């Protein structure tokens, strides 16, 4: 066994602050007191063990067995993450081989409100979920290194040289607006209670900048206290759960219809008697007392038959192209851990059955983020701005995916879906014109944007297994109203 040893050892770096877009702290690295021991030194001071064990709330015998078992180690932890005053009280004992150190632990000041977005670090302050993992290299910084001389029992008797100072991690400003985040969190929670639903998501996006202003899910968890958390509660459902968007994609089917040269909003489709047979398969409407409907009526009534007949006429290829160009079934580029791409199925040739099902959003799988990004493109006069969960100062060039005239026309149809007789009146936003589309899948969807005249915000509300299909619209109304007021958006109604 050696009389001495030398070791280059790490100087830990301070992990970068995560903030919201206005500098509100979301993840902060705080100094904690850690008590450790050198067993080889402890072994010389056995009469001190019971007082030390007692000061660590350990049974004397369990503690003594642990030191005896680790007799040839030179390091063990006693307890991590104390108060300065707490460790002081144990160092006050002056037990040979017992040492306090100040290390870094994450605190999450908004806790459950932004847990799924921010994620969290492990005991070693390494990113393990969410933004913490996705931007770990950015946030982590670079350990320093220093040389120590140790005696026969491995205690440090000299600091020899620092070869490298630690470099702190970098601040990261998310796209999240904490004020919008708290409003969405509260309103989604209250909606689940009032509707006896057990899960849900709500996304708010800036249609001009591609920024995710809010992303909240239920259930959630306190990242400051992860004791015995149900794994369901840690799911960022908005990014990692896929669902069938159903009626919510009909505005993309209509976009292809209006681009085709073959359809204007005043054109009529006969949907009588509210069913349509396709070989063995029958398309069924929810309401079945219509004959002639104009294209705006097809959206207000959300006629499956009506959108199917339009799709037969223009062809599935036109609709598939719009859906792909607005990002359905496509990588968002966000690199969020576990983020899903979902599924926009293709065919070399589209028979009638597959054509219809595409047109009314059956057999597709999207995330709430993808559906919000699609609505954002439609709201932004047909131009898709790339998504960001970090603050955007320099907005990248968007891609024109729907002609501005067609997008403008579809916006107007979606304003009627909210505002017109027979429409989703509970999605109406006080002081503003709003636009959007419901969907019903045991699952309630609402997607939309406001103000309808000069749109600023897209929003998706998803409510899982309510206990009564239109539980999502009033949530859109409340959260859109609050978000537009917080953003000083001038009323347009
Ligand atoms: C849209 O909200 C709706 C009119 C609701 C409905 C239950 O028919 N249409 C669809 O969601 C389209 C659709 C129909 C059947 C199915 O299995 C998935 C999607």
Swiss-Prot record:
Pathway: Cell wall biogenesis; peptidoglycan biosynthesis. It is found in: Cell inner membrane. Keywords: Carboxypeptidase, Cell cycle, Cell division, Cell inner membrane, Cell membrane, Cell shape, Cell wall biogenesis/degradation, Hydrolase, Membrane, Peptidoglycan synthesis, Protease, Septation, Transmembrane, Transmembrane helix. Its EC number is 3.4.16.4. The active site is at residue 247. Induction: Mainly produced during exponential phase of growth. Pfam families: PBP_dimer, Transpeptidase. It catalyses: Preferential cleavage: (Ac)2-L-Lys-D-Ala-|-D-Ala. Also transpeptidation of peptidyl-alanyl moieties that are N-acyl substituents of D-alanine. InterPro entries: Bact_Transpept/Beta-Lactamase, Beta-lactam/transpept-like, FtsI_transpept, PBP_dimer, PBP_dimer_sf, PCN-bd_Tpept. Catalyzes cross-linking of the peptidoglycan cell wall at the division septum. Binds penicillin. This is Peptidoglycan D,D-transpeptidase FtsI. It comes from Pseudomonas aeruginosa (strain ATCC 15692 / DSM 22644 / CIP 104116 / JCM 14847 / LMG 12228 / 1C / PRS 101 / PAO1).
